[PDB]
PDB file of all heavy atoms in Angstrom:
ATOM      1  N   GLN A  14     139.938 143.758 116.127  1.00 34.92           N
ATOM      2  CA  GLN A  14     140.215 143.122 117.483  1.00 34.92           C
ATOM      3  C   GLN A  14     139.414 141.844 117.631  1.00 34.92           C
ATOM      4  O   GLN A  14     139.412 141.236 118.766  1.00 34.92           O
ATOM      5  CB  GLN A  14     139.784 144.135 118.574  1.00 34.92           C
ATOM      6  CG  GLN A  14     140.678 145.323 118.725  1.00 34.92           C
ATOM      7  CD  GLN A  14     140.247 146.300 119.793  1.00 34.92           C
ATOM      8  OE1 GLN A  14     139.214 146.091 120.510  1.00 34.92           O
ATOM      9  NE2 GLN A  14     141.065 147.324 120.151  1.00 34.92           N
ATOM     10  N   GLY A  15     138.904 141.318 116.588  1.00 34.06           N
ATOM     11  CA  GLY A  15     138.184 140.136 116.525  1.00 34.06           C
ATOM     12  C   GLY A  15     136.721 140.118 117.019  1.00 34.06           C
ATOM     13  O   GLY A  15     136.208 141.191 117.475  1.00 34.06           O
ATOM     14  N   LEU A  32     136.783 135.386 122.554  1.00 29.80           N
ATOM     15  CA  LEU A  32     136.980 135.526 121.104  1.00 29.80           C
ATOM     16  C   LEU A  32     136.629 134.227 120.332  1.00 29.80           C
ATOM     17  O   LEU A  32     137.112 133.124 120.872  1.00 29.80           O
ATOM     18  CB  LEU A  32     138.386 135.902 120.907  1.00 29.80           C
ATOM     19  CG  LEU A  32     138.802 136.295 119.481  1.00 29.80           C
ATOM     20  CD1 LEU A  32     138.846 137.784 119.284  1.00 29.80           C
ATOM     21  CD2 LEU A  32     140.172 135.716 119.115  1.00 29.80           C
ATOM     22  N   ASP A  34     137.205 131.772 117.620  1.00 27.97           N
ATOM     23  CA  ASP A  34     138.367 131.505 116.664  1.00 27.97           C
ATOM     24  C   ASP A  34     138.361 130.062 116.066  1.00 27.97           C
ATOM     25  O   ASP A  34     138.494 129.055 116.710  1.00 27.97           O
ATOM     26  CB  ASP A  34     139.621 131.630 117.573  1.00 27.97           C
ATOM     27  CG  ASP A  34     140.957 131.393 116.742  1.00 27.97           C
ATOM     28  OD1 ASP A  34     140.955 131.542 115.495  1.00 27.97           O
ATOM     29  OD2 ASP A  34     141.848 131.060 117.365  1.00 27.97           O
ATOM     30  N   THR A  35     138.030 130.001 114.741  1.00 24.12           N
ATOM     31  CA  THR A  35     138.057 128.765 114.050  1.00 24.12           C
ATOM     32  C   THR A  35     139.379 128.194 113.499  1.00 24.12           C
ATOM     33  O   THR A  35     139.516 127.214 113.031  1.00 24.12           O
ATOM     34  CB  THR A  35     137.060 128.816 112.805  1.00 24.12           C
ATOM     35  OG1 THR A  35     137.472 129.826 111.982  1.00 24.12           O
ATOM     36  CG2 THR A  35     135.591 129.028 113.209  1.00 24.12           C
ATOM     37  N   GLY A  36     140.419 129.023 113.990  1.00 26.73           N
ATOM     38  CA  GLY A  36     141.743 128.687 113.666  1.00 26.73           C
ATOM     39  C   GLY A  36     142.626 128.052 114.666  1.00 26.73           C
ATOM     40  O   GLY A  36     143.881 127.906 114.690  1.00 26.73           O
ATOM     41  N   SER A  37     141.969 127.776 115.894  1.00 26.48           N
ATOM     42  CA  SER A  37     142.649 127.155 116.868  1.00 26.48           C
ATOM     43  C   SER A  37     141.640 126.159 117.657  1.00 26.48           C
ATOM     44  O   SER A  37     140.445 126.146 117.380  1.00 26.48           O
ATOM     45  CB  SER A  37     143.218 128.095 118.068  1.00 26.48           C
ATOM     46  OG  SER A  37     142.305 128.773 118.646  1.00 26.48           O
ATOM     47  N   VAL A  71     151.891 127.609 125.064  1.00 36.26           N
ATOM     48  CA  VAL A  71     151.451 127.861 123.786  1.00 36.26           C
ATOM     49  C   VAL A  71     152.200 129.135 123.051  1.00 36.26           C
ATOM     50  O   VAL A  71     151.638 130.221 123.248  1.00 36.26           O
ATOM     51  CB  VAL A  71     149.985 127.880 123.622  1.00 36.26           C
ATOM     52  CG1 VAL A  71     149.481 128.028 122.207  1.00 36.26           C
ATOM     53  CG2 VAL A  71     149.319 126.603 124.189  1.00 36.26           C
ATOM     54  N   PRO A  72     153.169 128.886 122.335  1.00 34.38           N
ATOM     55  CA  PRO A  72     153.766 130.025 121.546  1.00 34.38           C
ATOM     56  C   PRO A  72     153.260 130.173 120.153  1.00 34.38           C
ATOM     57  O   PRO A  72     152.980 129.114 119.484  1.00 34.38           O
ATOM     58  CB  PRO A  72     155.295 129.590 121.505  1.00 34.38           C
ATOM     59  CG  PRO A  72     155.350 128.122 121.612  1.00 34.38           C
ATOM     60  CD  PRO A  72     153.940 127.614 122.183  1.00 34.38           C
ATOM     61  N   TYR A  73     152.965 131.387 119.697  1.00 33.61           N
ATOM     62  CA  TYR A  73     152.559 131.558 118.309  1.00 33.61           C
ATOM     63  C   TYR A  73     153.715 132.359 117.577  1.00 33.61           C
ATOM     64  O   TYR A  73     154.748 132.523 118.135  1.00 33.61           O
ATOM     65  CB  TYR A  73     151.242 132.471 118.303  1.00 33.61           C
ATOM     66  CG  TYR A  73     150.127 131.916 119.046  1.00 33.61           C
ATOM     67  CD1 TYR A  73     149.782 132.556 120.309  1.00 33.61           C
ATOM     68  CD2 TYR A  73     149.443 130.813 118.563  1.00 33.61           C
ATOM     69  CE1 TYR A  73     148.672 131.981 121.007  1.00 33.61           C
ATOM     70  CE2 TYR A  73     148.383 130.302 119.428  1.00 33.61           C
ATOM     71  CZ  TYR A  73     147.955 130.839 120.541  1.00 33.61           C
ATOM     72  OH  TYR A  73     146.890 130.375 121.333  1.00 33.61           O
ATOM     73  N   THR A  74     153.431 132.682 116.273  1.00 34.72           N
ATOM     74  CA  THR A  74     154.314 133.451 115.491  1.00 34.72           C
ATOM     75  C   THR A  74     154.496 134.905 116.097  1.00 34.72           C
ATOM     76  O   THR A  74     155.600 135.387 116.238  1.00 34.72           O
ATOM     77  CB  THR A  74     153.767 133.623 114.096  1.00 34.72           C
ATOM     78  OG1 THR A  74     153.340 132.314 113.644  1.00 34.72           O
ATOM     79  CG2 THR A  74     154.946 134.010 113.188  1.00 34.72           C
ATOM     80  N   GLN A  75     153.300 135.422 116.576  1.00 33.12           N
ATOM     81  CA  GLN A  75     153.215 136.814 117.095  1.00 33.12           C
ATOM     82  C   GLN A  75     152.673 136.678 118.482  1.00 33.12           C
ATOM     83  O   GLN A  75     151.371 136.801 118.610  1.00 33.12           O
ATOM     84  CB  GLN A  75     152.449 137.741 116.219  1.00 33.12           C
ATOM     85  N   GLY A  76     153.532 136.505 119.529  1.00 32.84           N
ATOM     86  CA  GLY A  76     152.937 136.327 120.925  1.00 32.84           C
ATOM     87  C   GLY A  76     152.833 134.927 121.482  1.00 32.84           C
ATOM     88  O   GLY A  76     153.182 134.003 120.667  1.00 32.84           O
ATOM     89  N   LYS A  77     152.541 134.795 122.683  1.00 32.60           N
ATOM     90  CA  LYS A  77     152.389 133.548 123.470  1.00 32.60           C
ATOM     91  C   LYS A  77     151.605 133.643 124.760  1.00 32.60           C
ATOM     92  O   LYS A  77     151.476 134.724 125.286  1.00 32.60           O
ATOM     93  CB  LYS A  77     153.794 132.912 123.667  1.00 32.60           C
ATOM     94  N   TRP A  78     151.012 132.447 125.213  1.00 34.38           N
ATOM     95  CA  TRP A  78     150.448 132.361 126.471  1.00 34.38           C
ATOM     96  C   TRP A  78     150.889 131.102 127.178  1.00 34.38           C
ATOM     97  O   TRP A  78     151.166 130.057 126.514  1.00 34.38           O
ATOM     98  CB  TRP A  78     149.010 132.537 126.425  1.00 34.38           C
ATOM     99  CG  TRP A  78     148.222 131.599 125.713  1.00 34.38           C
ATOM    100  CD1 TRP A  78     147.764 131.770 124.359  1.00 34.38           C
ATOM    101  CD2 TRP A  78     147.708 130.387 126.054  1.00 34.38           C
ATOM    102  NE1 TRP A  78     147.049 130.725 123.951  1.00 34.38           N
ATOM    103  CE2 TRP A  78     147.011 129.819 124.983  1.00 34.38           C
ATOM    104  CE3 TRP A  78     147.723 129.637 127.317  1.00 34.38           C
ATOM    105  CZ2 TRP A  78     146.352 128.543 125.056  1.00 34.38           C
ATOM    106  CZ3 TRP A  78     147.115 128.363 127.361  1.00 34.38           C
ATOM    107  CH2 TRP A  78     146.417 127.854 126.277  1.00 34.38           C
ATOM    108  N   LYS A 109     151.941 139.594 124.243  1.00 36.57           N
ATOM    109  CA  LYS A 109     151.415 140.004 122.958  1.00 36.57           C
ATOM    110  C   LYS A 109     150.259 139.094 122.503  1.00 36.57           C
ATOM    111  O   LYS A 109     150.038 138.794 121.352  1.00 36.57           O
ATOM    112  CB  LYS A 109     152.582 139.912 121.756  1.00 36.57           C
ATOM    113  CG  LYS A 109     153.608 141.075 121.896  1.00 36.57           C
ATOM    114  CD  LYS A 109     154.748 140.809 120.986  1.00 36.57           C
ATOM    115  CE  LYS A 109     155.462 142.093 120.716  1.00 36.57           C
ATOM    116  NZ  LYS A 109     156.350 142.447 121.846  1.00 36.57           N
ATOM    117  N   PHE A 110     149.407 138.699 123.564  1.00 36.93           N
ATOM    118  CA  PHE A 110     148.234 137.909 123.252  1.00 36.93           C
ATOM    119  C   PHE A 110     146.946 138.722 123.545  1.00 36.93           C
ATOM    120  O   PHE A 110     146.161 138.839 122.577  1.00 36.93           O
ATOM    121  CB  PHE A 110     148.310 136.676 124.228  1.00 36.93           C
ATOM    122  CG  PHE A 110     147.128 135.674 124.097  1.00 36.93           C
ATOM    123  CD1 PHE A 110     146.893 135.116 122.925  1.00 36.93           C
ATOM    124  CD2 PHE A 110     146.205 135.640 125.137  1.00 36.93           C
ATOM    125  CE1 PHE A 110     145.750 134.248 122.882  1.00 36.93           C
ATOM    126  CE2 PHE A 110     145.037 134.846 125.030  1.00 36.93           C
ATOM    127  CZ  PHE A 110     144.899 134.054 123.938  1.00 36.93           C
ATOM    128  N   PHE A 111     146.746 139.330 124.733  1.00 36.93           N
ATOM    129  CA  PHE A 111     145.649 140.187 124.943  1.00 36.93           C
ATOM    130  C   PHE A 111     145.910 141.508 124.311  1.00 36.93           C
ATOM    131  O   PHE A 111     147.048 142.031 124.146  1.00 36.93           O
ATOM    132  CB  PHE A 111     145.440 140.337 126.448  1.00 36.93           C
ATOM    133  CG  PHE A 111     145.097 139.031 127.219  1.00 36.93           C
ATOM    134  CD1 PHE A 111     145.930 138.502 128.116  1.00 36.93           C
ATOM    135  CD2 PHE A 111     143.923 138.331 126.812  1.00 36.93           C
ATOM    136  CE1 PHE A 111     145.724 137.204 128.801  1.00 36.93           C
ATOM    137  CE2 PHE A 111     143.603 137.078 127.431  1.00 36.93           C
ATOM    138  CZ  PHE A 111     144.505 136.641 128.505  1.00 36.93           C
ATOM    139  N   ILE A 112     144.872 142.121 123.805  1.00 36.38           N
ATOM    140  CA  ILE A 112     144.954 143.469 123.079  1.00 36.38           C
ATOM    141  C   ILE A 112     144.554 144.617 124.094  1.00 36.38           C
ATOM    142  O   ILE A 112     143.463 144.451 124.845  1.00 36.38           O
ATOM    143  CB  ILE A 112     144.014 143.456 121.886  1.00 36.38           C
ATOM    144  CG1 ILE A 112     144.318 142.289 120.998  1.00 36.38           C
ATOM    145  CG2 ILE A 112     144.135 144.830 121.151  1.00 36.38           C
ATOM    146  CD1 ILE A 112     143.198 142.051 119.844  1.00 36.38           C
ATOM    147  N   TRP A 117     137.512 141.527 125.289  1.00 39.56           N
ATOM    148  CA  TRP A 117     137.533 140.094 125.446  1.00 39.56           C
ATOM    149  C   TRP A 117     138.718 139.694 126.361  1.00 39.56           C
ATOM    150  O   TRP A 117     139.742 140.379 126.468  1.00 39.56           O
ATOM    151  CB  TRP A 117     137.449 139.309 124.184  1.00 39.56           C
ATOM    152  CG  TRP A 117     138.655 139.562 123.200  1.00 39.56           C
ATOM    153  CD1 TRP A 117     138.661 140.528 122.185  1.00 39.56           C
ATOM    154  CD2 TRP A 117     139.877 138.982 123.242  1.00 39.56           C
ATOM    155  NE1 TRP A 117     139.835 140.405 121.481  1.00 39.56           N
ATOM    156  CE2 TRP A 117     140.701 139.512 122.140  1.00 39.56           C
ATOM    157  CE3 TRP A 117     140.558 137.937 123.993  1.00 39.56           C
ATOM    158  CZ2 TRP A 117     142.004 139.139 121.866  1.00 39.56           C
ATOM    159  CZ3 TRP A 117     141.787 137.616 123.760  1.00 39.56           C
ATOM    160  CH2 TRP A 117     142.565 138.145 122.594  1.00 39.56           C
ATOM    161  N   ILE A 120     139.824 133.050 124.664  1.00 36.63           N
ATOM    162  CA  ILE A 120     139.689 132.514 123.379  1.00 36.63           C
ATOM    163  C   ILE A 120     138.950 131.199 123.239  1.00 36.63           C
ATOM    164  O   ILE A 120     139.304 130.332 124.097  1.00 36.63           O
ATOM    165  CB  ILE A 120     141.039 132.523 122.592  1.00 36.63           C
ATOM    166  CG1 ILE A 120     140.845 132.296 121.108  1.00 36.63           C
ATOM    167  CG2 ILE A 120     142.003 131.610 123.285  1.00 36.63           C
ATOM    168  CD1 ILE A 120     142.013 132.717 120.212  1.00 36.63           C
ATOM    169  N   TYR A 188     142.753 121.937 111.351  1.00 48.79           N
ATOM    170  CA  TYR A 188     142.188 123.228 111.027  1.00 48.79           C
ATOM    171  C   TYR A 188     140.977 122.919 110.271  1.00 48.79           C
ATOM    172  O   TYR A 188     140.657 121.833 109.884  1.00 48.79           O
ATOM    173  CB  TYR A 188     143.170 124.078 110.259  1.00 48.79           C
ATOM    174  CG  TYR A 188     144.440 124.495 110.894  1.00 48.79           C
ATOM    175  CD1 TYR A 188     145.480 123.676 110.759  1.00 48.79           C
ATOM    176  CD2 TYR A 188     144.551 125.624 111.660  1.00 48.79           C
ATOM    177  CE1 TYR A 188     146.780 123.967 111.403  1.00 48.79           C
ATOM    178  CE2 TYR A 188     145.738 125.985 112.263  1.00 48.79           C
ATOM    179  CZ  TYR A 188     146.838 125.098 112.149  1.00 48.79           C
ATOM    180  OH  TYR A 188     147.969 125.426 112.742  1.00 48.79           O
ATOM    181  N   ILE A 216     142.878 127.397 104.871  1.00 45.56           N
ATOM    182  CA  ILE A 216     141.973 127.278 106.125  1.00 45.56           C
ATOM    183  C   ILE A 216     140.979 128.518 106.110  1.00 45.56           C
ATOM    184  O   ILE A 216     141.215 129.474 105.569  1.00 45.56           O
ATOM    185  CB  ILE A 216     142.792 127.166 107.375  1.00 45.56           C
ATOM    186  CG1 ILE A 216     143.573 128.495 107.730  1.00 45.56           C
ATOM    187  CG2 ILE A 216     143.762 126.066 107.388  1.00 45.56           C
ATOM    188  CD1 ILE A 216     144.048 128.604 109.105  1.00 45.56           C
ATOM    189  N   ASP A 218     139.463 130.796 108.938  1.00 47.79           N
ATOM    190  CA  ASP A 218     139.882 131.281 110.296  1.00 47.79           C
ATOM    191  C   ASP A 218     139.352 132.648 110.705  1.00 47.79           C
ATOM    192  O   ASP A 218     139.678 133.707 110.249  1.00 47.79           O
ATOM    193  CB  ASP A 218     141.400 131.364 110.203  1.00 47.79           C
ATOM    194  CG  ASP A 218     142.049 131.731 111.648  1.00 47.79           C
ATOM    195  OD1 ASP A 218     141.306 131.727 112.595  1.00 47.79           O
ATOM    196  OD2 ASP A 218     143.246 131.919 111.804  1.00 47.79           O
ATOM    197  N   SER A 219     138.393 132.543 111.674  1.00 46.30           N
ATOM    198  CA  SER A 219     137.726 133.632 112.180  1.00 46.30           C
ATOM    199  C   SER A 219     138.516 134.493 113.095  1.00 46.30           C
ATOM    200  O   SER A 219     138.268 135.703 113.346  1.00 46.30           O
ATOM    201  CB  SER A 219     136.377 133.316 112.837  1.00 46.30           C
ATOM    202  OG  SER A 219     136.596 132.471 114.052  1.00 46.30           O
ATOM    203  N   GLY A 220     139.639 134.004 113.501  1.00 43.17           N
ATOM    204  CA  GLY A 220     140.544 134.653 114.525  1.00 43.17           C
ATOM    205  C   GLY A 220     141.666 135.488 113.696  1.00 43.17           C
ATOM    206  O   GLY A 220     142.552 136.133 114.385  1.00 43.17           O
ATOM    207  N   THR A 221     141.592 135.451 112.450  1.00 44.37           N
ATOM    208  CA  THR A 221     142.665 136.186 111.562  1.00 44.37           C
ATOM    209  C   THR A 221     141.703 137.411 110.808  1.00 44.37           C
ATOM    210  O   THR A 221     140.691 136.978 110.290  1.00 44.37           O
ATOM    211  CB  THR A 221     143.358 135.218 110.620  1.00 44.37           C
ATOM    212  OG1 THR A 221     144.103 134.288 111.342  1.00 44.37           O
ATOM    213  CG2 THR A 221     144.256 136.146 109.758  1.00 44.37           C
ATOM    214  N   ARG A 225     145.098 135.912 103.927  1.00 44.18           N
ATOM    215  CA  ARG A 225     146.549 135.627 103.767  1.00 44.18           C
ATOM    216  C   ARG A 225     146.733 134.534 102.697  1.00 44.18           C
ATOM    217  O   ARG A 225     145.968 133.632 102.511  1.00 44.18           O
ATOM    218  CB  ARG A 225     147.140 135.038 105.100  1.00 44.18           C
ATOM    219  CG  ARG A 225     147.083 135.977 106.313  1.00 44.18           C
ATOM    220  CD  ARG A 225     147.442 135.365 107.575  1.00 44.18           C
ATOM    221  NE  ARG A 225     148.964 135.219 107.610  1.00 44.18           N
ATOM    222  CZ  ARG A 225     149.574 134.574 108.602  1.00 44.18           C
ATOM    223  N   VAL A 306     145.010 131.714 104.388  1.00 32.85           N
ATOM    224  CA  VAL A 306     144.110 131.949 105.515  1.00 32.85           C
ATOM    225  C   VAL A 306     142.904 132.733 105.039  1.00 32.85           C
ATOM    226  O   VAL A 306     143.110 133.918 104.762  1.00 32.85           O
ATOM    227  CB  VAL A 306     144.880 132.584 106.683  1.00 32.85           C
ATOM    228  CG1 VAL A 306     143.946 132.755 107.834  1.00 32.85           C
ATOM    229  CG2 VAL A 306     146.148 131.788 107.141  1.00 32.85           C
TER     230      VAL A 306
HETATM  231  C1  LIG B 401     148.641 131.030 114.755  1.00 26.02           C
HETATM  232  C2  LIG B 401     149.120 132.380 115.000  1.00 26.02           C
HETATM  233  N1  LIG B 401     150.409 132.778 114.769  1.00 26.02           N
HETATM  234  O1  LIG B 401     150.560 134.203 115.050  1.00 26.02           O
HETATM  235  C3  LIG B 401     149.287 134.603 115.496  1.00 26.02           C
HETATM  236  C4  LIG B 401     148.989 135.881 115.983  1.00 26.02           C
HETATM  237  C5  LIG B 401     148.435 133.483 115.432  1.00 26.02           C
HETATM  238  C6  LIG B 401     146.964 133.661 115.874  1.00 26.02           C
HETATM  239  C7  LIG B 401     146.671 132.665 117.018  1.00 26.02           C
HETATM  240  C8  LIG B 401     145.248 132.754 117.472  1.00 26.02           C
HETATM  241  C9  LIG B 401     145.072 131.756 118.687  1.00 26.02           C
HETATM  242  C10 LIG B 401     144.913 134.080 118.055  1.00 26.02           C
HETATM  243  C11 LIG B 401     143.908 134.861 117.458  1.00 26.02           C
HETATM  244  C12 LIG B 401     143.532 136.178 117.934  1.00 26.02           C
HETATM  245  C13 LIG B 401     144.162 136.758 118.930  1.00 26.02           C
HETATM  246  F1  LIG B 401     143.934 137.960 119.405  1.00 26.02           F
HETATM  247  C14 LIG B 401     145.269 136.031 119.496  1.00 26.02           C
HETATM  248  C15 LIG B 401     145.584 134.691 119.061  1.00 26.02           C
HETATM  249  F2  LIG B 401     146.617 134.193 119.733  1.00 26.02           F
HETATM  250  N2  LIG B 401     144.361 132.287 116.493  1.00 26.02           N
HETATM  251  C16 LIG B 401     144.422 132.386 115.248  1.00 26.02           C
HETATM  252  N3  LIG B 401     143.483 132.060 114.448  1.00 26.02           N
HETATM  253  S1  LIG B 401     145.967 133.185 114.515  1.00 26.02           S
END
Side-chain angles (χ1 to χ4, degrees), residues 14-15 32 34-37 71-74 76 78 109-112 117 120 188 216 218-221 225 306:
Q14 293 182 355
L32 189 98
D34 182 25
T35 58
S37 65
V71 183
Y73 305 108
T74 320
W78 62 265
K109 290 170 162 69
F110 178 68
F111 300 117
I112 306 165
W117 58 266
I120 189 158
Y188 296 91
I216 68 165
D218 185 7
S219 63
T221 301
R225 298 175 73 184
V306 182

